[PDB]
Amino acid sequence: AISEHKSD
Amino acid sequence: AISEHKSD
Amino acid sequence: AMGSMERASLIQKAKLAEQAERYEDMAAFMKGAVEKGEELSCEERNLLSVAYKNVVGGQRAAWRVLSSIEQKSNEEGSEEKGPEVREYREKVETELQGVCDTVLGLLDSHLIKEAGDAESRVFYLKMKGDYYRYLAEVATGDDKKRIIDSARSAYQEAMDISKKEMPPTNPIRLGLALNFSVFHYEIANSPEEAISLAKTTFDEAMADLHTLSEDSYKDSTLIMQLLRDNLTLWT
Amino acid sequence: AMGSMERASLIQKAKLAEQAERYEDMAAFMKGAVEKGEELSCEERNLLSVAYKNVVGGQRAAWRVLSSIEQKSNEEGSEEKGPEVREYREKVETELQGVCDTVLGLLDSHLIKEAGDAESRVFYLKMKGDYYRYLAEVATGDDKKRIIDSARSAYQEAMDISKKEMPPTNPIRLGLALNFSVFHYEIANSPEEAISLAKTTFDEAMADLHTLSEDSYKDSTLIMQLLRDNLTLWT
Ligand SMILES: [Cl-]
Ligand SMILES: [Cl-]
Ligand SMILES: [Mg+2]
Ligand SMILES: [Mg+2]
Ligand SMILES: [Mg+2]
Ligand SMILES: [Mg+2]
């Protein structure tokens, strides 16, 4: 998953 | 230049 | 920290450290700036976040490499070779926990309590959720559940304020929802909640894009694409 | 350093740190291993070199970014903004000099004096040349000339041994010649000497490739390509 996976 | 530019 | 340096000089040096990719220095400069005791502007909040995200990001990547080696060493047929893998993973883990505890300490003393506007309060509560989430990624003992709940509680309070006070395309609101969806998927074992949150957030933002200028549209759609990327991985 | 850790555990943890991209830790583990006082094997010499090259490489890249910002601030028409750029460049510079001094200290106490075989002695004298070269890159005072001469003297002694004791395709011999040619070009203001050295080294290696196995041919030609890359930039 990306946080800002994708992450923020 | 590369050392090992390119360098080593 | 850096008590003899002027606040403005610490901010200026954090920006230089960012350009030099010296993120440990950048974080130390920003920690010193926070400890001056004045609230942070939007740009200064971003510098604080960038600095610690990069420091903890390196630690997390190293921890994942070491944890994978350690798990392989505990499989059937693996040769012993001793305590070193576990010891070194523990060293990196302790350092990562220390960085998380330092960021949480800054939020608790006293960034959050002094943040009255929605933009600043949501930013800091999102950060609190994020750093408890990084603690959760490496937690295995009797406080894992309490760490997970602390991350959930911070993200939930941030989400409640963001939904009341910010438009659905606000980049902080979007980044919060993205990270809370990752929390659901990876930490809370709630993939359906993660998917539902990402989908609702994406759709509500799409419906509001018509209100935005070209630059705000670019800002919002960049984060929306990250929600879509996760949805494509999860569905 | 790391005096309570076994030598074998320090080597094992240096390899784990390399896999985790934790180069500061890798260097500290290898410094502890050297300080046990036993000679280093070829693999262990490579770990020492990889660890410190990556640490100093980050510092050099940061220093170059900061020096460029500082030089722009000293141009006509540039606004003042204060001592911060210089102070922070000086901080990074001092840290870089400290890493160089630490590596030079390990070579002097006592890696070089205990290295009797050509492979180990040339490796360490090349390292001595390299870290004096990194000191030279940031030197501006009354010892710049002596630092440049120390780098030259170490590379020259390494070259004299390598030419007597190693074939012209030996990867250490090749990497030494490559780095001494970069010293000539960038530090000593001797671009013709740099070009001549790179060309002679490349041609003498090419003439000896017929003696090599497929794997040794790959090792040597990879370094030969770096000599060619510099020659294309310089001519
Ligand atoms: Cl350790
Ligand atoms: Cl400084
Ligand atoms: Mg003041
Ligand atoms: Mg306030
Ligand atoms: Mg022992
Ligand atoms: Mg010996």
Author numbering:
A (entry chain B), B (entry chain B): 164 to 167, 184 to 187
C (entry chain A), D (entry chain A): -3 to 231
Question: What text does the study give?
Answer:
Mouse Double Minute 2 (MDM2) is a key negative regulator of the tumor suppressor protein p53. The 14-3-3 family of adaptor proteins are known to bind MDM2 and the 14-3-3σ isoform controls MDM2 cellular localization and stability to inhibit its activity. The data show that di-phosphorylation of MDM2 at S166 and S186 is essential for high affinity 14-3-3 binding and that the binary complex formed involves one MDM2 di-phosphorylated peptide bound to a dimer of 14-3-3σ.
A crystal structure of the MDM2161-191pS166/pS186 peptide in complex with a 14-3-3σ ΔC construct (lacking the final 17 residues at the C-terminus) was determined to a resolution of 1.3 Å. The complex of the 14-3-3σ dimer shows density for a single peptide occupying both 14-3-3σ binding grooves. The peptide binds in the expected orientation with its C-terminal end directed toward the N terminus of 14-3-3σ. MDM2 peptide main chain atoms interact with the side chains of 14-3-3σ N175 and N226 and, together with the pS side chain interactions, define the pose of the peptide backbone around the phosphorylation site in a MDM2 sequence-independent manner. In the 164AIpSE167 part of the peptide, a hydrophobic contact is observed between the side chains of MDM2 I165 and 14-3-3σ L229 while MDM2 E167 forms a salt bridge with 14-3-3σ K122. H-bonds are observed between the side chains of MDM2 H184 and 14-3-3σ Y181, E182, and W230 and between the side chains of MDM2 K185 and 14-3-3σ D225; MDM2 D187 forms a salt bridge with 14-3-3σ K122. The interactions of the 184HKpSD187 part of the peptide confirm the ones already observed in PDB ID 6YR617 and more broadly both peptides bind in a similar way to other 14-3-3 client peptides. However, the data indicates that the peptide does not bridge the 14-3-3σ dimer with both phosphosites simultaneously bound to each monomeric unit.
